[PDB]
Design a binder for this molecule. Structure first.
Ligand SMILES: O=C(NO)c1cccc(C(=O)Nc2ccccc2)c1
Ligand SMILES: [K+]
Ligand SMILES: [K+]
Ligand SMILES: [Zn+2]
Length: 397
């Protein structure tokens, strides 16, 4: 089946943050408005037997002291009184400040994504679902003891850890506009989790990694060559973005033969995202780079976790992820999803004006990266004794 994470409490928590507002509600309600919910298996978020079991799960990646501080931040933001200087300094030591502020539900909000993505991983492991979608997850920037980029807990890392610990290899594909630094770092020393991020990178652009640092770092220790990156200049359209990552994706699957694929599908590469950097679309006849990538990953018939992430044009993010959800149903079940070009009437219909259409309202370096990435993949296969056909992989590019 195709699973999707939702629930009443989950929805409330995913809509409780100042940065992402009600985005998750728009996403799930547009999926509902297009009558996709009956096609999908609801995956309930994971809950625990006790505080200690919860800490045991979250501190599989995060430090106890960081989790403590994040919970304290929520507590402090539920009281009217201003933080003490000592508490401000404590929060600063975990980067729980500036772009990762406190708010009254910050811990419950952050933990909810973890609950959803851990449940999604478990549904894949027990083979209840062949693919699971979590549009409340995908928070790729959070580090062991540091919040970053409005990511407080790294649900992706925790989900991947569950998968790899269930020879199991996981391929992580990060389609967000931003470099997936938190996930890359978590598995920097781990050959069995290969990370691949395609992203914009340029001087001063967040978070700064995923590019020449100069040479290209790619993992360390036994994880050498296991972290892949494709930085792209601003302005790239569906076709060029698709041709840039298509052969890399196919080569990674052929060589790594992953037992699971985890995809972060942040929507901030859309031409209409307020970042205004890439020119991708949700068009489904150019073909949306996102849909091209997802279709290609699902053609591998590997159990796959599809997560959300960035996306700051909330209606267009719902437009894109609704099409990703329909495409996943089609590819996995084999059942054609016919979707009207009109946004159906529903709770948030007015948010899609004035056009009220499903299509978003939008009218050599890469060759060098391919040669570099192919060489790195050969080095990865050699170091990890993976038998693969070099000529066939070369023909993909
Ligand atoms: O998506 C991200 N990382 O995957 C990310 C990380 C840090 C900051 C922002 C950010 O604030 N973006 C934004 C730009 C313009 C308008 C609204 C929001 C986004
Ligand atoms: K990315
Ligand atoms: K790795
Ligand atoms: Zn992003």
């Amino acid at each position: 089946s195709v699973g999707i994470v939702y629930g009443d409490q989950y929805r409330q928590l995913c809509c409780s943050s100042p940065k992402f507002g009600d985005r998750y509600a728009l996403v799930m309600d547009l999926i509902n408005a297009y009558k996709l919910i009956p096609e999908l298996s609801r995956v309930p978020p994971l809950q625990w037997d006790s505080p200690s079991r919860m800490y045991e799960a979250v501190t599989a990646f995060h430090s106890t002291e960081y989790v403590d501080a994040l919970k304290k931040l929520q507590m402090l933001h539920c009281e009217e009184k201003e933080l003490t200087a000592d508490d401000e300094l404590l929060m600063d030591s975990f980067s729980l400040n500036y772009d990762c502020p406190g708010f009254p539900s910050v811990f419950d909000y952050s933990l909810a994504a973890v609950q959803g993505s851990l449940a999604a991983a478990s549904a894949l492991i027990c083979r209840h679902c062949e693919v699971v979608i979590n549009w409340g997850g995908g928070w790729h920037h959070a580090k062991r003891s540091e919040a970053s980029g409005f990511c407080y807990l790294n649900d992706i890392v925790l989900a991947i850890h569950r998968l790899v610990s269930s020879q199991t290899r996981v391929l992580y594909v990060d389609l967000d506009l931003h470099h997936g630094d938190g996930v890359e770092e978590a598995f920097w020393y781990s050959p069995r989790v290969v990370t691949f991020s395609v992203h914009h990178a340029s001087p001063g652009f967040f978070p700064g990694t995923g590019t020449w640092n100069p040479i290209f770092l790619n993992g360390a220790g036994r994880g050498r060559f296991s972290a892949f990156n494709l930085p792209l200049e601003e302005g790239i359209n569906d076709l060029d973005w698709s041709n840039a990552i298509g052969p890399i994706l196919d080569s990674l699957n052929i060589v790594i033969q992953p037992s699971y694929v985890v995809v972060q599908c942040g929507a901030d590469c859309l031409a209409t995202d307020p970042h205004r950097i890439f020119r991708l679309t949700n068009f489904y006849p150019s073909l949306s780079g996102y849909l091209y990538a997802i279709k290609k990953i699902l053609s591998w018939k590997v159990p796959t976790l599809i997560l959300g992430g960035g996306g700051y044009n909330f209606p267009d993010t719902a437009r894109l992820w609704t099409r990703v959800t329909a495409l996943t149903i089609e590819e996995v079940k084999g059942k054609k999803m016919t979707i009207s070009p009109e946004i159906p009437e529903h709770s948030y219909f007015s948010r899609y004006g004035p056009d009220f259409e499903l299509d978003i309202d939008y009218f050599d370096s890469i060759q060098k990266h391919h040669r570099r990435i192919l060489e790195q993949l050969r080095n990865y296969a050699d170091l990890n004794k993976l038998i693969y056909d070099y000529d066939q992989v070369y023909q993909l590019y």
